């Protein structure tokens, strides 16, 4: 259900308009109330990155073909292959022990060169996020109830990005509406890439990807650089060199990628990346009219963890608590050192954890201190308590 605006959330002017200020989270709904008017439901539908530019490809599976060698006796000059001039080739120049036993008129170091065609079988793609183009869609519609004549209850879909924070819609009764909003992301994209590997995509640290000891290719394509990571030239004997491709490094990457958060790619667009977290702070501008705020009692009755506190990946902890008998009420949440004094020392990420009706399951996100702490939901004897260690 949607959660009703409190009195302080909106402000009505003597002249001009009325302004609502709200923080929109995903999978949650905020409603604006007005006397003898259908309630106005506003919700954050999605936050997305649309077609991020490719910054780098990192090869973890390489295959060698067309291996060619050339050799020269000592003091006859430098040995060369035409393939030395081709970027798709991995080459090495060295010298082997030559003499009478292998077709040379004098003992010594003979020039030997070896090239092989480098094709990357499997690579990880790294995408750069343009933070000024992170998109978000806000859905707004009058609360569907019994049919009222001349009331428009059409859904209004408002498309934003970081640059275009001001969009417009219109409702009956409420009139014209100007929404001025901003995105706050849950992870720092300035320090991050979106990494695509086969079916899957994660959000990874940039420096981690840069420090990978693997061949890479620039965003503007071209040749594969530092091929030597996956190409081995064994020491030469006579007039040959063994040229081997190293093994697939898929396991290393996948192992390292466990300690990294995933990102969902869209189902029917299949080019979008939709983020799970984030806040969207909005000022909604309406023409002057009366709104009805709702007061909220604090949850007193016994609650329960529908889902126990668990790590989210990006430093925060998510829980889901059920409110069986408390009615509509705000869930008191703190994070303390002990159960006695209970002085809050954590950061409540969730904006107003409120259960609309009884038997309703509510998400609560919290940022606990480093070390040992107690996540405390509710107050009094039936309060929920969950120990936690962060590092």
């Amino acid at each position, epitope marked *: 259900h949607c959660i009703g605006i409190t009195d302080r959330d909106f402000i009505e002017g003597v002249h001009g308009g009325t302004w609502v200020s709200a923080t929109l989270e995903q999978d949650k709904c905020v409603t604006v109330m007005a006397p003898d008017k259908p309630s106005l439901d506003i919700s954050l539908q999605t936050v997305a990155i649309d077609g991020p530019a490719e910054a780098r490809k990192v090869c973890y599976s390489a295959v060698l*073909t*067309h*291996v*060619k*060698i*050339n*050799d*020269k*006796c000592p003091s*006859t000059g430098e*040995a*060369h*292959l*035409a*393939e030395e001039n*081709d970027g798709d080739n991995a080459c090495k120049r060295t010298y082997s022990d030559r003499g009478w036993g*292998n*077709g*040379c*008129g004098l003992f010594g170091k*003979g020039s030997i060169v070896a090239c092989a*065609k480098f094709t990357c079988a499997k690579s990880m793609s790294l995408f750069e996020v343009d933070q000024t183009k992170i998109q978000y869609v806000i859905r707004a519609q009058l609360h569907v109830g019994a049919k009222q004549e001349n009331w428009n209850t059409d859904i209004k879909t408002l498309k934003f990005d970081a640059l275009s924070g001001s969009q417009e819609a219109e409702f009956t009764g409420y009139g014209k509406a100007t929404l001025e909003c901003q995105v706050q992301t849950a992870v720092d994209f300035g320090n991050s890439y979106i990494a695509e590997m086969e079916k899957d995509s994660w959000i990874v640290d940039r420096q981690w990807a840069q420090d990978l000891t693997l061949p890479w290719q620039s965003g503007s394509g071209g040749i594969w650089r530092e091929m030597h990571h996956l190409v081995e030239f064994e020491p030469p004997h*006579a*007039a*040959t*060199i*063994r*040229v081997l491709a190293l093994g697939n490094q898929e396991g290393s990457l996948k192992t390292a990628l466990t300690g990294a958060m995933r990102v969902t790619k869209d189902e029917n667009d299949n080019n979008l990346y939709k983020l799970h977290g984030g806040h969207v702070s909005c000022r909604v501008k309406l023409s002057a009219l009366t709104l009805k705020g709702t007061s909220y009692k604090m949850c007193t009755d016994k609650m329960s963890f529908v889902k126990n506190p668990t790590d989210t990946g990006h430093g925060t902890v998510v829980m889901q608590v059920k409110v069986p008998k408390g009615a509509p009420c705000k869930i008191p949440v703190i994070v303390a050192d002990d159960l006695t004094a209970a002085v809050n020392k954590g950061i409540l990420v969730t904006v107003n954890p409120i259960a609309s009706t009884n038997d309703d399951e509510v998400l609560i996100e919290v940022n606990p201190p480093f070390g040992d702490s107690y996540i405390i939901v509710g107050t009094g004897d039936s309060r929920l308590t969950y120990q936690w260690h962060k590092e």
Partner: antibody
Amino acid sequence: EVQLVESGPRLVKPSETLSLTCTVSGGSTYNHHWSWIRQPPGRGLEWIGYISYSGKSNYNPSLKSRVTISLEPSTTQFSLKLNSLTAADTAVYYCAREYRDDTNYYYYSLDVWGPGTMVT
Amino acid sequence: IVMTQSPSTLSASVGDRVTITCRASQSIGSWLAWYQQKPGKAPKLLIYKASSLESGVPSRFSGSGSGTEFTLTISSLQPEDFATYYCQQYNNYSYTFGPGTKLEIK
């Protein structure tokens, strides 16, 4: 840059011997199978034969009786010698390298050729 | 081992997709090479081991087949491509060339 050049008597009389010499530059002749191939004017290609640094050789069965191919590694060159010459031997003669790599197992057949010389 | 080719001659224009066939008397596995030759010039290696391109042969050229029957294919014919194409087995000695397939202009 490996290159081959064939030279010798362009004019030969019948019943004679034929001495052609292929010179290899840009690489040693320790590896690979050094070969001779010919092509009569307007007709197709005929593989004559090869010799290797080891001394192992092979000749086309239709020619084996008259054909000798020798290898001198000292100057990196190999020779073709044909005896009992006839008019059916009037041909363009190419020397070529059969590339063989027994370490990484790559075999490109005849990858480097000479321009060839016309023998009448 | 005896090699044969079909057709003996082919007439095509620029842009045409063409296919030439090579056949060995017995199984030669994948040990077949394709050569391109122009008048007054030495043969040039285009394909090795049945289906691998020499560097740097244009990728419009392809080869396929194993054992007995082989095919060379040019997806989009070009002015350069007009020439005589010889096949050659090199499974065993003596190495054998095909009689060749001439490709000329329409």
